[PDB]
Design an enzyme around this catalytic site. Sequence first.
Site, PDB file in Angstrom:
ATOM      1  N   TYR A  36       0.868  -1.173   0.000  1.00  5.76           N
ATOM      2  CA  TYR A  36       0.000   0.000   0.000  1.00  5.76           C
ATOM      3  C   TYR A  36       0.904   1.222   0.000  1.00  5.76           C
ATOM      4  CZ  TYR A  36      -4.602  -2.249   0.687  1.00  5.76           C
ATOM      5  OH  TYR A  36      -5.764  -2.986   0.521  1.00  5.76           O
ATOM      6  N   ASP A  39      -6.146  -0.416  -6.254  1.00  8.85           N
ATOM      7  CA  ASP A  39      -7.576  -0.108  -6.210  1.00  8.85           C
ATOM      8  C   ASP A  39      -8.015   0.530  -4.918  1.00  8.85           C
ATOM      9  OD1 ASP A  39      -7.498  -2.472  -4.766  1.00  8.85           O
ATOM     10  OD2 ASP A  39      -8.928  -3.567  -6.090  1.00  8.85           O
ATOM     11  N   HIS A  96     -11.217  -6.402  -5.536  1.00  5.78           N
ATOM     12  CA  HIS A  96     -10.863  -6.352  -4.113  1.00  5.78           C
ATOM     13  C   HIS A  96     -11.905  -7.076  -3.268  1.00  5.78           C
ATOM     14  CE1 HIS A  96      -7.817  -4.038  -1.512  1.00  5.78           C
ATOM     15  NE2 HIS A  96      -8.576  -4.604  -0.591  1.00  5.78           N
TER      16      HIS A  96
END
Lengths: 333, 333, 333, 333
Positions: C126, C154, C228
């Site tokens: 991330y 995403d 996701h």
Amino acid sequence: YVSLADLERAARDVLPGEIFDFLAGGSGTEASLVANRTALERVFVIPRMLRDLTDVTTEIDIFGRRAALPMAVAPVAYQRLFHPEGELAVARAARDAGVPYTICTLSSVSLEEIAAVGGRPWFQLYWLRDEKRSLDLVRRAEDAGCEAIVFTVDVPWMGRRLRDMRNGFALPEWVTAANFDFAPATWESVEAVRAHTDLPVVLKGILAVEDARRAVDAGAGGIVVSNHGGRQLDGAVPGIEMLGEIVAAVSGGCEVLVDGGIRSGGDVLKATALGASAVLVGRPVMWALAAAGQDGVRQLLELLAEEVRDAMGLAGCESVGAARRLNTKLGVV
Amino acid sequence: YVSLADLERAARDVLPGEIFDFLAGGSGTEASLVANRTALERVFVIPRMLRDLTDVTTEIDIFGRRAALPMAVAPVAYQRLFHPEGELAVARAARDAGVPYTICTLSSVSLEEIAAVGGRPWFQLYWLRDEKRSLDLVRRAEDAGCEAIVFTVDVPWMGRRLRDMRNGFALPEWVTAANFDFAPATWESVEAVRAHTDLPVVLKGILAVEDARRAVDAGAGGIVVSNHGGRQLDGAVPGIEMLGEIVAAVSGGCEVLVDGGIRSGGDVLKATALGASAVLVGRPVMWALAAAGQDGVRQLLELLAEEVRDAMGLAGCESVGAARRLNTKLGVV
Amino acid sequence: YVSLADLERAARDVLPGEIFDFLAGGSGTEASLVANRTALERVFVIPRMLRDLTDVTTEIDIFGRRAALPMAVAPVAYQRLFHPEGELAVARAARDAGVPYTICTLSSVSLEEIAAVGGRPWFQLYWLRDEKRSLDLVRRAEDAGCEAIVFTVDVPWMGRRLRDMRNGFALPEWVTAANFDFAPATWESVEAVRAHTDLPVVLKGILAVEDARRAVDAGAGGIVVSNHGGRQLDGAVPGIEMLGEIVAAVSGGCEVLVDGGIRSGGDVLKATALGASAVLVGRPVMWALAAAGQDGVRQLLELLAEEVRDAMGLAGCESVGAARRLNTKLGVV
Amino acid sequence: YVSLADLERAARDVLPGEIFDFLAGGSGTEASLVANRTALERVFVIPRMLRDLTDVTTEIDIFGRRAALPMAVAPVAYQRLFHPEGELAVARAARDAGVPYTICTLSSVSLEEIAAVGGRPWFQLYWLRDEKRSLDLVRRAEDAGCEAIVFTVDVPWMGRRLRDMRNGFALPEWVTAANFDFAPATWESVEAVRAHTDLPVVLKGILAVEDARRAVDAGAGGIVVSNHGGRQLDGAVPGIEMLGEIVAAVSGGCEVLVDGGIRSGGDVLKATALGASAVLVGRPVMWALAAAGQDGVRQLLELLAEEVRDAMGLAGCESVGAARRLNTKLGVV
Ligand SMILES: Cc1cc2nc3c(=O)[nH]c(=O)nc-3n(C[C@H](O)[C@H](O)[C@H](O)COP(=O)(O)O)c2cc1C
Ligand SMILES: Cc1cc2nc3c(=O)[nH]c(=O)nc-3n(C[C@H](O)[C@H](O)[C@H](O)COP(=O)(O)O)c2cc1C
Ligand SMILES: Cc1cc2nc3c(=O)[nH]c(=O)nc-3n(C[C@H](O)[C@H](O)[C@H](O)COP(=O)(O)O)c2cc1C
Ligand SMILES: Cc1cc2nc3c(=O)[nH]c(=O)nc-3n(C[C@H](O)[C@H](O)[C@H](O)COP(=O)(O)O)c2cc1C
């Protein structure tokens, strides 16, 4: 009553279960009976706006006569099963509403008595044993003032109605085929009828495009695109799903009617937008007859008239012809 | 019994639950088992009207012999699980009905005993350990009078039947593989069989179009388009969904049969309208066997014969060949 | 356990409801969460028959290393929520099964501890506050022996998980982000990562075809086609529905993985037949962890391995590459 | 409240059942009411990743003014049915949220009082008895500061709302049409309005592509693609299903809004990805009004603003214009 389903609920309360089942049922697994409703529920109308509605009319001309709605009462055998006045109650209400009534070969009141009620009677033919008896039945209907011969072409024999089999359903002694004191029809039978009447011959139970074309070539004045309410071949396509293709193939050569599951004025509008000239309505008329006799049928026809007018105007159609030019879009339910 | 579902209900009452589950179940999540039914329910037939039905026949010629219906009893292993007379009861009823019966490699009565019943026996082959034993089994079947070799080609090994795993299902001691005192098949195995028999070789379990074409090129006399009743690959397409494309690709080079979920004469008509030469029926035959032995299977076959005749005539088909020329339309259920 | 759903049932019994909801839930109305399953259930495989299966292997080469199955453990944050051994239990089981394990930026055990377990660790990134901290995290992962950087693309911010909002869900004090003592990623962030590692960069969360093409142009070694797990945009298309179009557009320029709802070996086969190189599996791995720790994850991976081998062989595929050449047909459920 | 459905639940608790039914219901069988939701649920967005979101704005310019969201409050008659402050509560909340509020011809507070609240009021016109009275109503709205005339074009008369018929629903004595101390509109009526105001004229209730084109040719500044919440023709297509085709046909010649079933920010994103300039929201605003008055509407608009921002950013859209360039894929639910 504010919908046709209100009448269904009323008829279920009053009729004996085995008679309700004779009316409601289909053949086999009832796949075609259910599909008639599924198919209508998938059709959505694309309404038009802002058109002149100062003279909205639901009337049509068909088989040489004006009708108040693009609708006729479908042939339903043995109407005394549902109410003691049977066919006379239904025919009186149809006459007063300006709707054609189809007198059945298997009516429980004689065709001459029903025709004497007046109105616009049509006569439904099941082909008999021999050509001579079948033509004599056509001639009786014509002499009595029937205006069209609705030759049912989807019954070489009757389908397998499992509810009736399971119930052991039989006609009560007080219900008879009042026109009497059958063999499978063919194209030759159609020609024999056509040659022996000046009335328009309407073939009821056409689903294949090539049979619709052949009906025009055979001199039919109309067809009814129909799977017989799901009571004949279980798995037969709904008429409403063949209608557009059939209307294109006949290209105005005969009137194209449809039946099966018409349960509101909005369903009438869907059928017309798919190209039908008119619809037939069967089971709901018998629900109204069972619930309240002649007055029940009158109320059903008044409700349908209101729903048809409402749907047409909301869709921007001042006439049935304008409704036939509406477009549709299939959805999911 | 007025439908095949009446027989299912009867068999569930009588059989031990674990045996009912061995019969009813599929592999994995049972997606392919359910899809066999979904797929048939989506197909609607476009019936033809007004055709000559004075000599309606359900008979076909297949693999050199007349059959009374376009149907054979599918191979189902270990029929003594369902009734003490097992395969002999089923074979007797099939013989008396004029329907071919497929004798299994894993039959619970020897293939020679079942063949001695008479009728039209076919023999289903599972490929064994070595070519020599497999060919000796084919030769036993041919010597006993079997008319076709149904080589099952979708079982390199058995699928994962979770109901059987969860139940810990095992054969009772009183049920054995009576032909005995397996390895995955390949195209080479097919050629070995073809070279060692004059009987037609039928490949059961074909779903890909190119495998159907290769089957014709390999000298097969037929194929069965099938996902093995949803018992092999979970997620395999239903045979009924590949049938039309396969029939077009083989273009008459072999007989094309289908199975999976055939539960009425109307389903037989759907399969034929999609181009099948004939169907196999598996689970319903075992429901009838469990419910009432030989007489139960007789009643099932009489009901199916009536339903097939009914559906054909309602659709305007005086022969199975005419039924193969019917068109269909997919709907929603 | 004979299916992955057996593990779901086991995990629901053991976990506190709010933790089960954090694991199971999606964003918004959960439309995308449900659609991941719907979409897989609509895909049917067309299996091939009669092929040589004497050396059936489920192994693949990906990102420079052999994997035992075409599968990796998806990144799932905070695994100590589900079992006290958290990520170490899962990583040990994945190592022993020969399956890559994705170490999360938000792991509850430090990435160096998890990497020390061995196996094939990947590292999920991330994007942080500044480029410098983000690149230092990539360098930690590379120094610890991670083999690929799975850059999640995403999550400019986290979606709206209404179950967590309604439950007031918060991490227990005993669960922390163990890699620490975020800002939205862009294509510039991808380039910064690519320029600062020799490891393959895999973009997880690609759904648009043009973003898959741009990922190849940007130097990605792979993408994961994914919504996701339905936890980000509610209404985002399932990855499985974009997979075929994406595989065609990249035309071998990078590995194309997929995730979302993979719940069996048959689902792995579907994904490969649609063109995936491999799948990720998320929630089921946490069900196994919750139910039985390391041994539970081992059992899950053994079951999945058996199901993948079974599905491949039943479909005639001796390798994953052959499975990618299978055709599929969409059905209705 | 974390979703709009939380507000629905709150309003059902508080309102008398017949008032809840007046708000919730549709015409006929409610097929079009349900289809508005079905249609939105079938649309899936294909989000884009990795785009710059440093200045994500939900603002649009429409009819000469900035709006904070691509949304306006739909015209809903008689808002004092739902809360004593009625339209003033809703208009105050809309003003404070930067959302246009549509004042109804059938408002229960006079249009001048509602306009005095400020904000961006639009005025919805139902065509009256004569052109002169209708134009005087338009002139009142313009003199009071309304910014657009939303001419409702799908109500030649009101549809058949069976819940209201069955309940015998009537306005309480304390709710009146406060603008008063109707005849069907046509294209001539539209021209009369256009010629007598400089405000943009927006035709609400367009579904046919040719009516959208004619609206542009007639000088409309916008249209609302709408089936009137399923309250007019039962069986009318959902606006969301015609939107893409209408947006292509007008090709920027007017603003194209949509309504019917918008229940989240994700639904707003779907509408914009299909090409809408903005949406209207009707029933949810009245749920919020019933549940908690002005503060309830404020909370609804804050939630919708958060959901729209969330959905846009998750989809990679820094502006509404970027959202209109998103692609979509239809799925099954
Ligand atoms: C109880 C019953 C009796 C019927 N009798 C006849 C008949 O005598 N002749 C005929 O052509 N169709 C007959 N039909 C078919 C109807 O004319 C009509 O095609 C069918 O019911 C579909 O319309 P529906 O869904 O409106 O009932 C009958 C249908 C029912 C339910
Ligand atoms: C209990 C059972 C046993 C079966 N045994 C065999 C077999 O020995 N050989 C074979 O090729 N197929 C076998 N099959 C598959 C059937 O031949 C048939 O393909 C399948 O059941 C689909 O038809 P149905 O839906 O009519 O049952 C078996 C099926 C069942 C249910
Ligand atoms: C509880 C939970 C935590 C997750 N954490 C991450 C994460 O830290 N990074 C990431 O890229 N995806 C994360 N994901 C998404 C998964 O990697 C995966 O894309 C998704 O769960 C779909 O696969 P599934 O249906 O097999 O669970 C998470 C998913 C869940 C359910
Ligand atoms: C109770 C109620 C009253 C309405 N009143 C009007 C009206 O006066 N004028 C108008 O053009 N539409 C009116 N509508 C239609 C709405 O403007 C809107 O088109 C419809 O409700 C669809 O949006 P929704 O699903 O968000 O409610 C009304 C709708 C409802 C439910």
